Amino acid sequence: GTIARTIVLQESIGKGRFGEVWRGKWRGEEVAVKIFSSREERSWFREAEIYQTVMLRHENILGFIAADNKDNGTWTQLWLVSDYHEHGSLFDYLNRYTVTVEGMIKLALSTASGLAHLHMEIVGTQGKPAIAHRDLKSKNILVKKNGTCCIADLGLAVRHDSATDTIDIAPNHRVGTKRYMAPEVLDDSINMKHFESFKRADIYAMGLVFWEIARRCSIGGIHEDYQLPYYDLVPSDPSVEEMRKVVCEQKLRPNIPNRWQSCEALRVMAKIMRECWYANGAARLTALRIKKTLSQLSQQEGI
Numbered sequence: 048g049t050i051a052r053t054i055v056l057q058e059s060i061g062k063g064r065f066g067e068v069w070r071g072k073w074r075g076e077e078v079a080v081k082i083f084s085s086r087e088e089r090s091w092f093r094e095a096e097i098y099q100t101v102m103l104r105h106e107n108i109l110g111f112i113a114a115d116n117k118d119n120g121t122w123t124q125l126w127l128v129s130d131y132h133e134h135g136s137l138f139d140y141l142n143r144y145t146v147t148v149e150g151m152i153k154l155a156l157s158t159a160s161g162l163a164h165l166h167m168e169i170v171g172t173q174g175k176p177a178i179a180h181r182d183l184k185s186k187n188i189l190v191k192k193n194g195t196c197c198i199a200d201l202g203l204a205v206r207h208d209s210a211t212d213t214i215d216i217a218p219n220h221r222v223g224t225k226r227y228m229a230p231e232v233l234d235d236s237i238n239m240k241h242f243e244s245f246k247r248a249d250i251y252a253m254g255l256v257f258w259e260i261a262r263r264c265s266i267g268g269i270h271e272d273y274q275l276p277y278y279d280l281v282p283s284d285p286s287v288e289e290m291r292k293v294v295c296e297q298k299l300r301p302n303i304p305n306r307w308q309s310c311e312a313l314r315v316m317a318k319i320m321r322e323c324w325y326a327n328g329a330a331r332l333t334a335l336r337i338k339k340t341l342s343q344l345s346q347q348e349g350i
């Protein structure tokens with residue numbers, strides 16, 4: 048179509064399970080283009096569908112531009128064009144850098160604001176359904192030039208129909224990254240007919256992302272090396288069974304160092320992590336509550 052024909056692909060930046068991401072140039076601006084082959088149409092259409100949700104746009108959700116198709120004369124490519132963020136993922140960003148207390152708050156608060164907006168239902172003519180991500184992880188969050196985050200990779204999301212309490216794709220199977228799966232997802236006790244259960248599972252994964260950020264907070268030169276949650280307990284690419292034995296059976300969570308109690312910002316962050324990590328989903332903090340807590344901390348710090 049008219050958009051893909053005017054875009055020049057410059058570099059393949061990533062190869063995921065669904066599609067390949069490229070840095071492209073559109074009307075002289077950098078854009079990110081996710082390309083799927085003809086046989087991945089279901090995945091491409093679903094992601095285009097979630098990104099076109101009414102009232103979805105928010106400073107902390109990846110800016111979607113357009114879905115399109117491009118025929119090179121041999122095969123057709125299915126495109127999803129979005130805003131380009133040079134830092135890339137929060138995973139890449141935390142591996143490369145350490146952050147200040149201010150930097151940590153900015154990353155955590157923006158992640159929570161994006162999640163609170165996904166989770167929020169807006170009632171009306173131009174109403175927005177509540178949305179649950181189902182695959183929140185530091186590799187699915189991007190860092191913007193201003194040091195704030197935006198949630199990306201919404202292709203596995205589910206949308207709620209509030210009047211009937213029904214989910215748009217009626218999920219009957221476990222999806223997402225095994226390492227970040229909530230205890231109720233790992234042991235398959237989650238009620239997949241209960242939308243609030245998917246919001247609660249996202250909060251647990253956001254808790255693990257906050258732990259990743261806090262390790263990289265550098266105070267008086269003190270900080271931890273980058274690690275994925277459960278790095279000390281499971282192998283790389285862990286199985287459901289491996290995760291379940293740790294999270295559900297032994298009931299372990301990532302370690303919270305006592306030295307996070309000697310700094311106010313880290314203390315608040317530690318308290319949030321613990322309250323995201325309860326085995327009972329109903330006891331977890333909401334994304335709005337986390338946003339309110341970190342907004343108060345940001346104000347106190349003068350960011």
Ligand SMILES: Nc1cccc(Nc2ncnc3c2C(=O)CC=N3)c1
Binds near residue numbers: 061081128202
């Ligand atoms: N969900 C989705 C759809 C289309 C592109 C993307 N990815 C990106 N978007 C913007 N900037 C980026 C990226 C990367 O992957 C990596 C670096 N910078 C995700």
